[PDB]
Amino acid sequence: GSSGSSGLREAGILPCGLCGKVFTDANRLRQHEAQHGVTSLQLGYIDLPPPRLGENGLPISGPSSG
Ligand SMILES: [Zn+2]
Numbered sequence: 001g002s003s004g005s006s007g008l009r010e011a012g013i014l015p016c017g018l019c020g021k022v023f024t025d026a027n028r029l030r031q032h033e034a035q036h037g038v039t040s041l042q043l044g045y046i047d048l049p050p051p052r053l054g055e056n057g058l059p060i061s062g063p064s065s066g
Pocket of ligand 1: 016017018019020021032036
C-alpha cells in the first residue's frame with residue numbers, strides 16, 4: 001500500500017510574493033514571474049545603465065603624512 005498520482009491538478013493560486021501583485025490565472029502569473037526571473041533568465045529587453053564606479057592613477061607608497 002502506497003500513494004502515487006491519484007487525484008486532480010491541484011496546484012494553488014496565490015499573489016506574487018515578490019512585488020506584491022495579485023493574480024488568479026496560473027498561466028497569467030507564470031508569465032509575470034518571468035519579469036522577476038523566478039529560476040529563469042528573461043532577457044531581450046532594452047537596458048542602458050550608467051558606467052561602472054572606478055578610478056585609476058595613484059602611487060604605490062602613498063602620502064607620507066601623520
Ligand atoms: Zn511580481
